[PDB]
Structures are given as C-alpha cells and as structure tokens.
Amino acid sequence: SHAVKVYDTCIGCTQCVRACPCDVLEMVSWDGCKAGQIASAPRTEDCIGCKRCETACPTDFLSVRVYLGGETTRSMGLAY
Amino acid sequence: VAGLTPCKDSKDFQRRLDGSVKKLKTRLAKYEKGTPPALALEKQIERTQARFERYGKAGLLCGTDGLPHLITDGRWSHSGEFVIPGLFFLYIAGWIGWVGRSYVLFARESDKPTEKEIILDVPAALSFVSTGFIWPVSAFKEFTSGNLIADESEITVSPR
Amino acid sequence: FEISDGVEFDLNPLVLAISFLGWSLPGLLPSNIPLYGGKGLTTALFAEIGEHLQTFPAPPPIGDPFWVILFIWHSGLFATMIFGTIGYNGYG
Amino acid sequence: TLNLQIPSPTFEGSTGGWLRAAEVEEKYAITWTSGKEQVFEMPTGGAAIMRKGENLLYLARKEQCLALGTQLKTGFKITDYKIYRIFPSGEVQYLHPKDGVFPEKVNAGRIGVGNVSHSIGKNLNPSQIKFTNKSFN
Amino acid sequence: MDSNFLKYLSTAPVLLTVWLSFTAGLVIEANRFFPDMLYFPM
Amino acid sequence: KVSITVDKDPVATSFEKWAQPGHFSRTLAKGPKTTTWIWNLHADAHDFDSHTSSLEDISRKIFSAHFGQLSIIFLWLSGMYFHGARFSNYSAWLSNPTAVKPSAQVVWPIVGQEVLNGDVGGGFQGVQITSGFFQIWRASGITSEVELYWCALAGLLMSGLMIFAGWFHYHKAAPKLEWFQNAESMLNHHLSGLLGLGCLSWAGHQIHVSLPINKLLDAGVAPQEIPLPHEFLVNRDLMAQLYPSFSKGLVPFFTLNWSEYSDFLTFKGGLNPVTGGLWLSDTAHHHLALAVLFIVAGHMYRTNWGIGHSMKEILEAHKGPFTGEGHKGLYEVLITSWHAQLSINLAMLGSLSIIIAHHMYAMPPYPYIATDYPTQLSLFTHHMWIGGFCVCGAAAHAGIFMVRDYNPAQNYNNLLDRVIRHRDAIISHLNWICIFLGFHSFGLYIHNDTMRALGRTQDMFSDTAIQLKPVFAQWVQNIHTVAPGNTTPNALATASYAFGGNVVSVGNKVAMMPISLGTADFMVHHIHAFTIHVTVLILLKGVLFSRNSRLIPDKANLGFRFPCDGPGRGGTCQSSAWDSVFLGLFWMYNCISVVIFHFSWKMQSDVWGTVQADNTVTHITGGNFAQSAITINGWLRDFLWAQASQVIQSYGSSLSAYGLIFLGAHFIWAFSLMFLFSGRGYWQELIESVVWAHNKLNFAPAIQPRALSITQGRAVGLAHYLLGGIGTTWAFFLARIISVG
Amino acid sequence: QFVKPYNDDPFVGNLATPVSTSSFTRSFLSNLPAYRSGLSPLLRGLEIGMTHGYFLVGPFYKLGPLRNSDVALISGLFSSIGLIIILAACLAIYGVVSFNEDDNTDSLQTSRGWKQFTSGWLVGSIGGASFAYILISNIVFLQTSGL
Ligand code: CLA
Ligand code: CLA
Ligand code: CLA
Ligand SMILES: CC1=CCCC(C)(C)[C@H]1/C=C/C(C)=C/C=C/C(C)=C/C=C/C=C(C)/C=C/C=C(C)/C=C/C1=C(C)CCCC1(C)C
Ligand SMILES: CC1=C(C/C=C(\C)CCC[C@H](C)CCC[C@H](C)CCCC(C)C)C(=O)c2ccccc2C1=O
Ligand code: SF4
C-alpha cells in the first residue's frame, strides 16, 4: 500500500483529514502545536494515493506526505 | 574578396537582376499603359533596379549563387554587415531592459505592485522610457554601487 | 412469454395481421407512375415477386422497381406494426 | 454491529453496481437514518429515494461509501451513517465512524500512526540508507 | 476624460497593443522610405 | 401569460469596472498574486454561470452578448460588401465571369508583399477570394459598386443598431426571467416571423429583382444595359415581358389559380445550363413554400389565446414501457439551463453546417460557383470544420449542464436518469463497434498496402480484385436519377446530377457530373463511419461519466473542468468531461481532415475537369482515385506528395503567401506537441531557475511567474495543434485549387 | 415497466432487460451446450467444437491465399486444423493457469472439467472441419455459393 506520514510541522488544521475521500487520516492529541492535535494515518491500507490530503495542507511544504508504494485492489481503486 | 567576388562585377548577380526585371516586364506586358497595374509593375521594376544597384555599390560580396554574403568575423571592411547593426540592437535592447527593470522596482515600492503591473502608471513608465537613453553608464553605476547584483544569501534557492 | 424478468407480454399475432392489413389496404391505391406501373404498392410488390420468381436465381437487377417497392412497403409495414403494438398494449 | 434486514433506498437498478469482485473479495455497506423520503444521487450513477427511517446500501468501494456519506452530511443533514466491510466469510467489519466520532475531531483513545519527529528537510538520503535497513526518517 | 477610462487604457493589453502597433508602424515606415537595407551603409 | 416585463436602469453605464479586471468573479477581483490570474481572467470571462447565481442576470448577459455578436457579424458583412465595392473586380467578373478570377482584397507594396497582388483578371490585380461573395451578389441581382456601397452602409447601420440594442437591453431596459422563459412564444415568433417572413421577403426579392436581372444576364445583356430593380418593380409591363404571368396580377394568387405563376414559380430541377447553378425560379418557389411552411409551423404553441400546444404536456405525455417516466422534467431542464439549450443548438447547427456543405456542392445554388472550383472546395471544407467544432461544443456544454445544472431530485426515472443508470452498456457497445469499424475499415487499407507491396495485386480489395461495392449507395443514386417523371412527376430534371445524368459544363469546364462509387468509395465511407463513431465515443463517454464513475464516485464536486484527481487509483489524468472534449476535438480534427481529403481527391479525380470538343472530360488528376485511393501509399503519393507541388512551388508567385502559411502552420502544429507531450512540473522548475537569474539582478515581477495550469497547457496544445493542422490543409487546398482552377 | 433491477437486487452491476432476462433469452442460453444441464464438460466441448470448426472451414476455403487454386479446399481444411490446434493450446494453458487442482466434481470450472472440455473441443472441432470439408468437396452448391 502507499506510505502516508505526518511531521511535526503539523498545525492541527484537520483539513487533511477532511479532504481524504477514504478514511485514512484521523486527528489525535498532541502538544507540539497550538491546536493540540496532530494528524495520524492508522488506516493506510485504504489509501488510494490521490494526494488530496497533500493538497489540503497549509504548511511550507507539507506536514503530510504520501509516498506511492505497492499497488493493491484498494490502492488502485478497482471496483471489479 | 575574402573568399568570394565583389557583387558589383558578378555575372550571377547581373543574371539575377535580369531575371527579376524580365519577370516583372512579362507581367507588365499584359496591362495597358498608365493603368494602376502598369504603374505598380513599373514601380516594382524601378525598386528592383535600385536595390540591385545599391547592393552592388555597397561593396557586398557575392558567391557563385549570385546572392550577397555576409562576412561576420570582425573585419572592419564589413562592419556594416553585422557589427554596427549589432551595436544598434544592443543599444535598443539594453534601453528596453533597463527601463523595464526600473519600472519593476518602482512598482515593487508601491501600495499595490501587482495592480501597478497589470494597470500601468504610464507617467512613471514614460519617465523610465526617457531615462533609458544612457542605460550603459546607468547600468554600470548600479553594478558598481552594488544595487544590481544581489547577494547569494539573499536569493531563494531550492535544497540540494 | 415474459418480455423481461417477470413482465408478461401477450404477443398476439392478430395485432400483426391487423397492422399488415392496415398498411397494405391503403397500399392498393394505384398510381400511373412507372415505378408502380399502374397498380398500387402492395399489388406492385406481388407482381415483382412473381416476375422475379419466374427468373429465380437472378436477383432483381439494380434499378429494378422491386427494391424501391420493397423498401417503401416494408418501411410502412414496420411503422404500422409498431403503432399497432403500441395501440394494442398501451391503449388496448 | 450491522443488521442485514434494514431496507434499501428503493433504487431502480443500474449497471454501476458491484460485480463479482464484491462476492469474491470485499463488499462495503452503508447504513443511515433519514427523517423523510428524499431523493439522493447514487455514487455509482442515477437517482434513488431514501426511506423514512433506516436505509442500508451495498457498494463495491469504501470510496463510494464515503462519497455517499459526504453527500448525506453536506447536501442533507444526515450524520449517523455507518460504514462496514463484508467478506465472503460474512465477517462484517466496522470502519467509518471507527471510534463512534468522525476523524475530523480529536478523540481520546487514538494512537498516532505514521508520525515523524522532524520536518521533511531532515530526511536522510538514499545514499545514506543504501545497502542498509535504515529508514529515510 | 474619465479617470476610470484612462485606467482602462493604461491596462496591460491595451498598452501592449498600442505600443506594438506603434513599433510596427515605425518599422513599416522605415522600410517604406528606406527599403531593402540589408546592411548599415558604410 | 406571455407578457413583457423589464427592469429599468439595472446597471449604470460607467467605466469604473473597465479598470477593475476580474470584477465579475469574486476570486479574481482581489488581484493577480500570480500569472495564473491573468489566464483565469480570460478563461472565466464569459462563464456567466460562475459569476452569479442569478438566472435573470445570466440571461440578460447572454441577451446583450448576442446583440454584440450580431453587431460584429454586421460589421463583418459591411466590410465584405465595402471591399467588393471598392477593392474588387466585380464589374469585370460580371462582364466575363468565366475568365477573370474573383478578387476583393489588395495588399500594400511594403516589403515586396505586392507580389501577392496577382493577375486575377479584368485589368485588376489583387488577392483571389474563395468565399463566393461575387456569386452571391450576382444571384442577388447586384450589378454595380454603388449597390455594394449601399449594402455596406446598410450593414454598418445594422451593426450600430445591434450594439445600441445590446447596451440598451443591459443598461436601460433589461427583460426579466419571466420574459426569457417563454419557450412557446419564442419558438412561435422565431419560426413564423424570423424564418417564415425572412424566406418570404427573400422570395419577394428574388421574384422582383433577382429573377429578371439574372434572366437578362444569362441572355447576355450587359450589366450596364440591364434596367434597375425599382424599374422592374414599377413597370409591370417590363416584368411581364420576361415573365408573362405578371400581366395577370395577384388575382391568381388570391383565387388559388397558382398555375398561372408557373413561368417564374417552377419545379424544374437540375442546373441552369448557362450559369451552372440552380434555377433562381426554382429557388424563389422553394423560399415561398418554406415561408408558408414556417408561418404555419409557428402557430403550434400556446401563448395567450388558448389555441396551441404546451411542450410540457407533449413531453410528459410521451413515455413508454422501456423509458419509465419518459420526457418528464425536460421542459424544466431546458427553461432553467442555458447550457442544455446551447448543447442542443450547437449540435443541430453543426450538423446543419455539414448538411449545407454537402448540398451546396452537389446542387450549386449560385450562378458560376460550380465552375469556380476554389470557391466550392473552400466552402465545403470551411462548413465541414464549423460543423465539427459546433458538435464538439455541443458535447462540452452537455457535460457542463450535467455537472452544473443537473438535479437528480427533478430527474428521477426519466430518460436522462435511465441513460446515466445504463451508461456502462452504451459505452461498452460503442467501444466494441468502434474497434470493429476501425479494424474492418483501416485494416482493409493495410491489407491492400501489404498485398501491393508483396505483388499479390489480385488479392487486394479493389475493383480489379476482391470487390466491396456500395450497392446500397448505387441503388439510391439510381433511384434519384430515375425519379424525375416517375416519383417526382412534375420535376424536369434530377435534384443533383451527382446521382446520375448528363454532364453540366460552363465555359468548357465541368460544373457537375455523376459521381461514381466503387470499392475506394466504400472504404472511405466506412472510414468516415469509424471516425465519427470514435469521436462520439469520446464525447459521450465524457458526458455520461462527468458526474461520477467507478473510479471517482464524486466527480461533480471536482467540477466539469479539473486537471486530475491525483496519481492515486493508478492515475486519474484527464478524467473530467473537459478532457473528453479535448480528446474528442483531436478526433474531430481527424474525422474532418479525412472527409475534406476525400472530397478534394474525389472531385479532382472524377468530377472536375475540362471537357474537350469530343465531349470527353479530362479530370484534374484523371481517375487516380479509383486505383490509388485504396492504399495508404496511394494517399501519401497520389494525393499528398502529388498535390503538394502547387503549394511548395509557390515561391515568387501570388501563392507565395500560401507557401509561407503552409510552413508556418507546420511550425505551429509541431509547436503544439511541446505542450501536449509535456507537463507542468518541468516548466515550473525551469521558471524557478529563470527567476533565480532575475533575482540575481535584484529585480523580479510582483506577479510571480507560474507555468500554465495543467488544463491550460492541454488547451494551448490543442489550440496550436488544430490551428497548425487546419492551416496546413488551408494553404495546401487553396494553393492547389487556385493553381489548377 | 420492462427494465427492472437484476434478480431484484438494485445494487448489483446489472439490469433486467428484455435482451438480458426475457423468456426467449433465458430458454436459448439455458439450452446452449455451455449451459445445458446434464452435459459432461466433454460433451459441451464436443458440441461447441463440432459447431465451430464447421464454420471455420469456409472463410479459409473461399478467401485464403490458395483460393483460386485446385487445392483451395484442402488448404482451407489444413488452415482450419492449424487454427484449431492453436485454440486448443490456448484452452489448455488457460485451464492449467486458471483452475487449481481442487476437485469440484467436473463443473467446467475445474482442472479436470476444463481438461475434458478442451479435449472434447479439439476432437469436435477437427471432426466438424472434416465434415465441412467432405460436404464442400462433394456438393457443387457449396463450392459455388449457389452460382
Ligand atoms: C532585426 C533583427 C533582430 C531581431 C528581430 C532580434 C530579436 C531578438 N533578439 Mg536580438 N540581436 C540582433 C538582431 C535582432 N534581434 C543582432 C544583430 C544581434 C547581435 C548584436 C543580436 C543580439 C542579441 C542578443 C545578445 C540577445 C538578443 C535577444 C533577442 C530576443 C529578445 C530581445 C529582448 O528581449 O529584448 C529586450 C531586452 C531585454 C529583455 C534586456 C535583456 C537582454 C538584452 C539583449 C541585453 C542587452 C545588454 C547586455 C549588456 C548585452 C550583453 C551581451 C553579451 C552577454 C553577449 C529577440 C527575439 C536576446 C535573446 O535571445 O535572449 C534569449 C538576447 O539576449 N539579440
Ligand atoms: C463563423 C462561422 C462562419 C463563417 C465565417 C461563415 C462564412 C461564410 N458563410 Mg456561413 N454559415 C455558418 C457559419 C459561418 N459561415 C453556419 C454555422 C451555417 C449554418 C447555419 C452557415 C450557413 C451558410 C450558408 C447556407 C451559406 C453560407 C455562406 C457563407 C459564405 C458567405 C458569407 C455570407 O454573407 O453568406 C450569406 C449567406 C447567405 C446569402 C445564405 C443564407 C441561407 C441560410 C439557410 C439562412 C439561415 C438563417 C437562419 C436564421 C439560421 C438559423 C437556422 C436554425 C434556426 C435552423 C462565407 C464563406 C454562403 C455561401 O457559401 O455563399 C457562397 C451561403 O450560402 N453560410
Ligand atoms: C454558440 C457558441 C458557444 C457559446 C455561446 C459558448 C459559451 C461558453 N463556452 Mg464554449 N464552446 C463552443 C461554443 C460556444 N461556447 C464550441 C464550438 C466548443 C468546442 C470547441 C466549445 C467548447 C467549450 C469548452 C470545452 C468550454 C467552453 C466554455 C464556455 C463558457 C466560457 C467560455 C469563455 O470564457 O470563453 C472566453 C474566450 C476565450 C477563452 C477565448 C478562446 C479562444 C482560443 C484562444 C482560440 C482563438 C483562436 C482564433 C480563432 C484565432 C486563430 C488565428 C491565429 C493566427 C491567432 C461559455 C458558457 C467553458 C466552460 O463552460 O467552462 C466551465 C469550457 O470549459 N466551451
Ligand atoms: C441469428 C440468426 C439470424 C438470422 C437467421 C440465421 C439463420 C442466419 C440466424 C443465425 C444462424 C447461425 C449463425 C447458424 C450457424 C450454424 C452453424 C455454425 C452450424 C454448425 C453445424 C455443425 C455441424 C453440422 C457439424 C458436424 C460435425 C460432424 C458430424 C463431425 C463428425 C465427427 C466428429 C465430431 C469427430 C470424429 C470424426 C467425425 C465422425 C467426422
Ligand atoms: C512550454 C510550456 C510551458 C511554459 C510556457 C509558458 C509559461 C507560456 C508563457 C508565454 C508568454 C507569457 C505569452 C506571451 C508571449 C507569446 C509569444 C505571445 C502569444 C500568446 C498570446 C496570444 C496569449 C508551460 O508552462 C506548460 C505547462 C503545462 C503543460 C505544458 C507546458 C508547456 O509546454
Ligand atoms: S493539513 Fe497538514 S497541517 Fe493541517 S492537519 Fe493535516 S497535516 Fe497537520
């Protein structure tokens, strides 16, 4: 599957979580940002690689990165 | 003379002139005298003859094909072929670039630089256009005063 | 007979017969134009069928009125068949 | 848990529905309660009528299920949509509102997965992680 | 003249069109009165 | 109630917003932070549906834009008429239409471009024109430059009226949405008034002006000696000499004794032997009958007086067992969405342009247009291109409607919904048929090429080998040839001699002769079918999958025109309905190019030519098409390589412009591939390096330079591709035909 | 009215239409050898190959390279046999690749079922091509297409 990673530049805006067509990103608690929340990628096996999370990211270069890796049915979005 | 013959005494050049004039005269033979077509073709013949005579007297060199060739090596006998025209270009181009850069800085120090760049302040633009006539000394003055070249630590660059 | 998974369809051949008659009886209207000869569309079709059955293995030649008569008659017949099925099954 | 007896939104049928891969590998389901009988757009194509009460729908992709959920949440004001994944064994799983609350808002109990303790500029080089098991993080 | 109309004339495409038409006219008239200049006369 | 309601002074005419580019759009009014703003301004300039949510505002904007377009068209027409009056050899062409080439453009002698003022004829040298305006004017009965000056004046006055009307109906009296949403009244008035009265007025003009003037011109009377149209109008005796039924008056008309008008209202058919065009007496009757038909058709719909139909009732009543609700909701869709109407109207207008091209060559309607081969080829190909573009635009706006104005709530189990719900079947079947046609149409050419290259010429698909005869087309041609007197008893000649008959020759040159269809014609027709089907596949697939698909369940949210949805799912490049239009435009170019090439070769090889004293006709290429058009090598050599000689040897002649444009169009076509084969990242990085270079000199634009958007790059590539290809064909066709005709 | 959900399942990727689910369609499909009931995978292949080689012989015979020769029919039969062998190889490789050795009792979706099907198809195809060859060689009508 694709490898989705989050970095400390995260500000907890949550737009990455709201932009994901699947449910791959969720907000968890953190102390490194004013919002007190950081993005996490627990369901990375459902990622398709659209990079909508990357698009909906306001930090200078992204706090969330999608590295496209091995392809599966779910990653390829094959309904057949 | 360099590797070719002067165009003023080239049978090929004379033959090309004769061919052009004969084509024009053949076209003219089918039009009544004094009609606009006849006058236009006669003027074309006159222009062709004047062009060939001027090229012959200019000192241009012509090859076996009968067409003038340019010696763009630096020879002063052929400066008018590339160097002096090139100097005129460089003058005009530096004028344009200098005035454009000046206007860019002027708009940079404005309330809305983008507005000044899409909707111009033509009084200031014409001011800079006028300034552009001594761009060589002005550009060198900028360079030596250090207002032209930016420091390496003040220009954004991608990571290695 | 089911026209679909569970939808029944009557498929009455009397509809076919009625549509055939409805198109053919008006087809009897004669015309003196060369294509029809002097007869109507249906009679001309019958005459051409007989004439080209007398010469069986040689198809009506291109330009023979047979092809035009066939096409016009069958266009009208199919139109009437569609309309008659519509009437029998929706307005029936 | 998922109740397989919930009625469906009286769809008229389409060619965009699930295929043999749904019966062989995975088939997703979405259940939601509606206050009235509205008309919504199927993620596969066409219009359907949701019922007054509980509606269960079957799809081939989690993305289709979540697109339908987003349509319900935004177009309508239905936010009680639950998503499940069913295998041929019949092992229904629960996926979308995993922790009963949508991921867009933090909730106590979640553990960060895939978080890195530096910026992207601190990643190692492939030359440094070549012929080694190190990770570029 | 209306200041808004003057700003509209000052807009980039209008100025580019006018300036390049003026330049084209300059070159065309130069070639009309001094044609066939393949060289700087020396 | 169909009534007039307007808002007075809705928008104040002021230049304030002229100095605020992007005012129409909320995102653009802010300002150009980057160069992408400049392109967005133009891309969204006329997308009124994205400026506001007010259908009233959108409709008013569209109405005023239409007025502006009409003013522009009137200015164009006035310019053409004025050029015909002032910079033309129209009088010489009238004196001797078969010897002097029409010309209405003259170039200035600046850099030697005066060579383009070729010896067209009639003591006049200019740029030969291929628009048919001279023939239009001759048919209209114009015989002077004074009349053309008056035509130009009328065009200018109408342009002024149209621009004033646009301004007035936007800023002074803007009609309301209730006024706009009158489909019944708007169709009644268009049909009856616009069309019916237009063709009635044109029939009157033809009966009172064109018919006698052209009668005398064909009789050989000098244009200066022919009397004036008002003389014909007021001297019923003078007109009664040419058409002896005017002595009867209008009593036959009002008593239904219409046979008295057979002299000037006749169903004759064929072509005028002198001019080679259709009988103007046939055209007058045609237009009179059309006027009656349209005025009757315009009385079908209900406006204010109870009598009439309601399209809503008709549509809702038309439904069957296979279609569920049927046409329910379509009336509301069409009176609430401009994009659906635009799609329908564009599709119909493009198909009409194609039909017009076909019919205008097989039945030359104007005097001396048939033997003006450059005019015929140019008009045919021009209208073919307009038709293709209009069809592609119809697809684009169908997609725009589907994304924007489509509402499932109002479209349930109707035809639109059912199409969406079985779109997979449609596209799969169209895919299979496209593959089948591609194979059995192009693999035939490949087979012929291979057999000819192997020396097995007896194994080819040719008239001298295995034959593929278009028996159905030949049968139709035979029907039309024999129809005069049999199935059209009161018609003297066939509608077109292309179906069959005798050669029509004007000035010892073929105007129209029978066009014979063989194996090559069968092949090229099936290739036309293949290309059309593939174009339809692309456009229809995009339109149907505009909103959602198995790959992207939420695509309407992305929009009608978006670049991609990311490299995920394997890659979602060009998935939108805009990219479908982009690819379908490529394929329309392919289709129309093949069509126009077929026309050019077939007409130069089997129709056009010079007729000898023997009565035998030698064609421009001489039967090359039958035995060469069956192989791709034959097309490459006997059509492209052979016929490109005229354009590549045009230097030093009046077609040197055609040669230069040939080269420039090649340049632009190649230049398009830079945008089509490339991507945005490379150019953005190159711009980063260039911006570093600029910054090193302590200056850089405040509007940060950016590479073109992905969609904009595709659009630029497509625009340059189409311009280059069509310009290459333009120069090639015009040079070849003007050299050999 | 005539178009409905497939098997009363609105969300399956199929529609119940007259072409897809009519009584005539169902009867025809259920009576074809690929679906008829009772036939062993071998008999299905036999019938299908019998049917297919028969029509394969014709195109080669009347449009092959040696069609204007004395040996046109024999050449057509031998090309039909070659194509039949190629397709039998295709069937065999498909069977070995797709179906694993688990035994589902010859349902045509098994290794054994598909092996029997391909064997029967080869036999029936060769037999049908030979039968068509005999008929064409012995009947003038078939050699001339009625001319
Ligand atoms: C009628 C003939 C003709 C035409 C139509 C052109 C047209 C062009 N020339 Mg020019 N050029 C000509 C004759 C002509 N040239 C001749 C005879 C010479 C020999 C001297 C040159 C030498 C020349 C150079 C050296 C350059 C051009 C460039 C250009 C292009 C961009 C110019 C520009 O942006 O100016 C507007 C001005 C600016 C944007 C300011 C910056 C650029 C100018 C040229 C700087 C001038 C001063 C500078 C100190 C010169 C240092 C030169 C040294 C490094 C060699 C343009 C297509 C430029 C190009 O192709 O860039 C990719 C370019 O750099 N030309
Ligand atoms: C921008 C696109 C474009 C351009 C540049 C041209 C250019 C040309 N067209 Mg036009 N044309 C276009 C689009 C275009 N056409 C389209 C889309 C159509 C289809 C409706 C036509 C249909 C058409 C016809 C039928 C004729 C031309 C002709 C011409 C030439 C003479 C111009 C003229 O004044 O004709 C003036 C036009 C006429 C005197 C004939 C008008 C007859 C038509 C049937 C009137 C229809 C009007 C009606 C309101 C349109 C809506 C119909 C709809 C409701 C069904 C010229 C090459 C004429 C030609 O080839 O002359 C040699 C010609 O006869 N065109
Ligand atoms: C009746 C005709 C008609 C009308 C009223 C409209 C109206 C519209 N179209 Mg368009 N469209 C049409 C025909 C029409 N279309 C056709 C025939 C096609 C097929 C090609 C399309 C394909 C199409 C697409 C694919 C899209 C639109 C869109 C739009 C909307 C915005 C367009 C815009 O802002 O343009 C402003 C004007 C421009 C940007 C200028 C474009 C011109 C280019 C650069 C080429 C010009 C070349 C020119 C002929 C010169 C060449 C010679 C060279 C030497 C210079 C608008 C509602 C857009 C939309 O709705 O998006 C939401 C959209 O995406 N249309
Ligand atoms: C769909 C449609 C529309 C319009 C009407 C139309 C009729 C055309 C209809 C289509 C009809 C079609 C496509 C019909 C096609 C029929 C075909 C392909 C029939 C094939 C029949 C095959 C036959 C006998 C095979 C006979 C083979 C035999 C003994 C083989 C015998 C042998 C075998 C098998 C093995 C050992 C050797 C031996 C003993 C010789
Ligand atoms: C070359 C190229 C560029 C670089 C080109 C750019 C940025 C175009 C900028 C050109 C200037 C600003 C236009 C003005 C100068 C032209 C010579 C004038 C003609 C244009 C007007 C008529 C609009 C891209 O940005 C790009 C993006 C995506 C896919 C393909 C490509 C691509 O191929
Ligand atoms: S968007 Fe970037 S920053 Fe905002 S939450 Fe998601 S990751 Fe953290």
Author numbering:
A (entry chain C): 2 to 81
B (entry chain F): 24 to 183
C (entry chain O): 56 to 147
D (entry chain D): 4 to 140
E (entry chain J): 1 to 42
F (entry chain A): 12 to 752
G (entry chain L): 3 to 149
Tell me what the authors wrote about this structure, in their words.
Here, we report the cryogenic electron microscopy (cryo-EM) structure of PSI–ACPI, an 885-kDa membrane-spanning photosynthetic protein supercomplex, from the cryptophyte Chroomonas placoidea at 2.7-Å resolution. The cryptophyte PSI core consists of 14 subunits (PsaA–F, PsaI–M, PsaO, PsaR) and the subunit Unk1, which is not present in other previously characterized PSI complexes. A pigment-binding subunit that is not present in any other previously characterized PSI–LHCI complexes, ACPI-S, mediates the association and energy transfer between the outer and inner ACPIs.
Two distinct classes of PSI–ACPI were identified: 1 with 14 ACPI subunits (2.66 Å resolution) and 1 with 11 ACPI subunits (2.71 Å resolution), possessing similar B-factors. Apart from the finding that the PSI–ACPI supercomplex possesses 14 ACPI subunits, we also observed 1 class of PSI–ACPI that contains 11 ACPIs but not ACPI-9/10/11, suggesting relatively weak associations of ACPI-9/10/11 to the PSI core. ACPI-9/10/11 may then associate with the resulting cryptophyte PSI–ACPI intermediate structure. The Unk1 subunit mediates the interactions between ACPI-7 and PsaB, resulting in the shift of ACPI-7 outward from the PSI core compared with Lhcr2* and FCPI-11. The interactions between outer and inner ACPIs are mainly mediated by ACPI-S via their loops at both membrane surfaces. The ACPI-S-mediated EET from outer ACPIs to inner ACPIs is unique to cryptophyte PSI–ACPI.
